[PDB]
Amino acid sequence: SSVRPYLEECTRRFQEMFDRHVVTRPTKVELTDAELREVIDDCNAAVAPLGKTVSDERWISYVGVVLWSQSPRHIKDMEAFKAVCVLNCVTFVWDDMDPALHDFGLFLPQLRKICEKYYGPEDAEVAYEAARAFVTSDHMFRDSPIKAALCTTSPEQYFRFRVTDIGVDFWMKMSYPIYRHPEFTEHAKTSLAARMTTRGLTIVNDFYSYDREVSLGQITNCFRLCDVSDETAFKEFFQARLDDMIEDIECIKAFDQLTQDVFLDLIYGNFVWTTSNKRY
Amino acid sequence: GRSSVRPYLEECTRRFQEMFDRHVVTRPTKVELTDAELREVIDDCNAAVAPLGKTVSDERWISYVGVVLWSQSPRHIKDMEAFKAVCVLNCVTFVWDDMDPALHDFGLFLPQLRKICEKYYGPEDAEVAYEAARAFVTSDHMFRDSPIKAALCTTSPEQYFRFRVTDIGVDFWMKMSYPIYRHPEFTEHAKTSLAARMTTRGLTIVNDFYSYDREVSLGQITNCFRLCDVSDETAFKEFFQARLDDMIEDIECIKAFDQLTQDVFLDLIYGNFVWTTSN
Numbered sequence: 001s002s003v004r005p006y007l008e009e010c011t012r013r014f015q016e017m018f019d020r021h022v023v024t025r026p027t028k029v030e031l032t033d034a035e036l037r038e039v040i041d042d043c044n045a046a047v048a049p050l051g052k053t054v055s056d057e058r059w060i061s062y063v064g065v066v067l068w069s070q071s072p073r074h075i076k077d078m079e080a081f082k083a084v085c086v087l088n089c090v091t092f093v094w095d096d097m098d099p100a101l102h103d104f105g106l107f108l109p110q111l112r113k114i115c116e117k118y119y120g121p122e123d124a125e126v127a128y129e130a131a132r133a134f135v136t137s138d139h140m141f142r143d144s145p146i147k148a149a150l151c152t153t154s155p156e157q158y159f160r161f162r163v164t165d166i167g168v169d170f171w172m173k174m175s176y177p178i179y180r181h182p183e184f185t186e187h188a189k190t191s192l193a194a195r196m197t198t199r200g201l202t203i204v205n206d207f208y209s210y211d212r213e214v215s216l217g218q219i220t221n222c223f224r225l226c227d228v229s230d231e232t233a234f235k236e237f238f239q240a241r242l243d244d245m246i247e248d249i250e251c252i253k254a255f256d257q258l259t260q261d262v263f264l265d266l267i268y269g270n271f272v273w274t275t276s277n278k279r280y
Numbered sequence: 281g282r283s284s285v286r287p288y289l290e291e292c293t294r295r296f297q298e299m300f301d302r303h304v305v306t307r308p309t310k311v312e313l314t315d316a317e318l319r320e321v322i323d324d325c326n327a328a329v330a331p332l333g334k335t336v337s338d339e340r341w342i343s344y345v346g347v348v349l350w351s352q353s354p355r356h357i358k359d360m361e362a363f364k365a366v367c368v369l370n371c372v373t374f375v376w377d378d379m380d381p382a383l384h385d386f387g388l389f390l391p392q393l394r395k396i397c398e399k400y401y402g403p404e405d406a407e408v409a410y411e412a413a414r415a416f417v418t419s420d421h422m423f424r425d426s427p428i429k430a431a432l433c434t435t436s437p438e439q440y441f442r443f444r445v446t447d448i449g450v451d452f453w454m455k456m457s458y459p460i461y462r463h464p465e466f467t468e469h470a471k472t473s474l475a476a477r478m479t480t481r482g483l484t485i486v487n488d489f490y491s492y493d494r495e496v497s498l499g500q501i502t503n504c505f506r507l508c509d510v511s512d513e514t515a516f517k518e519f520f521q522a523r524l525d526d527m528i529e530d531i532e533c534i535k536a537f538d539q540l541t542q543d544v545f546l547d548l549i550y551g552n553f554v555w556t557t558s559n
């Protein structure tokens with residue numbers, strides 16, 4: 001099965017939706033050559049004990065999601081920003097690895113080292129715990145009956161699983177120190193930030209990963225909840241998902257201005273990055 | 281505003297019970313506290329709220345603690361120190377929540393919560409429990425008369441329950457209760473909040489039904505029944521059935537978790553209902 005017939009039309013409709021509902025176009029956070037080299041050197045050091053050597057061009061493709069999905073207008077701590085770059089990137093490499101090579105004994109101390117370098121004492125613990133929780137969860141749900149249950153029952157159960165599994169809770173808990181904004185920090189720490197953004201991130205990620213994921217027997221994709229071969233059923237399901245994104249976006253506008261800027265920059269930025277050629 | 285669910289009180293109570301009898305089956309049981317343990321719990325609660333100038337009777341503390349005695353899962357308890365912590369944290373947060381918010385002194389109260397966590401938990405768990413407590417009371421203070429609360433609570437059941445994962449206190453509950461069980465799977469679900477996300481609807485629908493009359497008379501909007509017109513029998517019946525269907529879907533999904541975790545989750549939801557109806 002495949003969403004290839006719908007690829008152009010769904011891309012057009014996603015963009016049209018963001019143009020109408022978010023308006024502010026994503027922009028890319030600027031890293032200096034020195035900052036990017038520091039980010040990459042930390043990524044390399046974190047994954048070396050795992051015997052992984054990764055090219056700059058691969059790291060640069062992983063990091064693009066942070067550069068595009070964060071909110072440059074509101075950045076206050078670039079040390080935190082670099083931490084998110086590193087943590088995102090090394091987590092991508094970890095997720096791309098044969099799980100039989102997952103050595104948590106080697107990896108978790110590296111994640112702690114990154115958090116301690118870039119964050120102050122309390123924020124380091126918060127970011128590390130979120131990272132630890134994410135990678136631990138992933139290891140638990142590999143072929144869990146729970147994963148099967150939540151991902152096949154209904155969109156609501158599926159997105160409930162994905163708040164953690166897509167990594168958005170981790171993302172918010174390592175990102176709030178970038179902004180140093182008290183309200184955002186609380187929504188990140190209660191996970192309301194993650195609960196508000198999960199659908200907009202997951203629906204876009206799922207659409208564009210569907211052909212690959214079903215080909216690999218992966219069940220964490222909301223489009224597996226419809227018959228994509230039936231154009232009628234697909235369109236109906238796709239419209240229902242667009243409607244979910246729009247409901248979330250309109251609710252997000254009730255948050256304070258900076259928080260809403262960050263949430264909408266994340267959802268729209270992730271879309272632009274996902275569809276980018278820099279990422280093909 | 282002047283509305284009420286009194287006409288449905290008996291029938292809905294009967295249908296909640298029938299639903300739990302069919303879908304959970306295992307009846308709630310109460311955790312036993314010795315006299316000494318209850319005295320220790322009550323002494324810690326009184327100490328925690330003394331800086332706020334609050335005097336609370338033993339009978340009041342015992343009424344609050346009943347939710348912990350009924351909603352935890354006695355077969356699987358391993359750490360009664362953690363269990364005492366949950367009794368104290370639950371009770372003192374009930375008192376804080378019952379106070380006129382103009383008397384909320386965080387500078388006095390937060391250190392008392394930390395004191396409690398440090399006494400009963402190990403280093404790491406004390407921090408996890410304290411953060412969850414801190415986040416919970418900080419959220420409550422944030423969402424008073426906030427546009428966000430209005431939006432989430434009036435938009436759809438989905439947006440409302442998304443807000444209540446934190447606001448009803450279940451994420452806090454899970455993050456202070458996992459040490460009671462020392463069960464690695466449960467500890468992770470509590471830490472990722474999947475535990476809270478799974479149990480939010482069953483706890484919230486029950487609490488909201490039995491608090492509706494009081495909450496609408498106080499202009500509080502955090503109640504899912506405000507999303508339907510409780511004066512229209514037909515609309516109410518329809519909405520009540522959809523909420524039962526929501527509880528059932530969650531319960532059936534919860535049975536995919538490992539046995540101990542599912543026992544804990546289902547004991548929480550069913551035990552909360554028993555305590556709510558006896559209260």
Ligand code: NA
Nearest residue numbers: 027068070269
């Ligand atoms: Na951006």
Ligand code: NA
Nearest residue numbers: 309350352551
């Ligand atoms: Na019980």
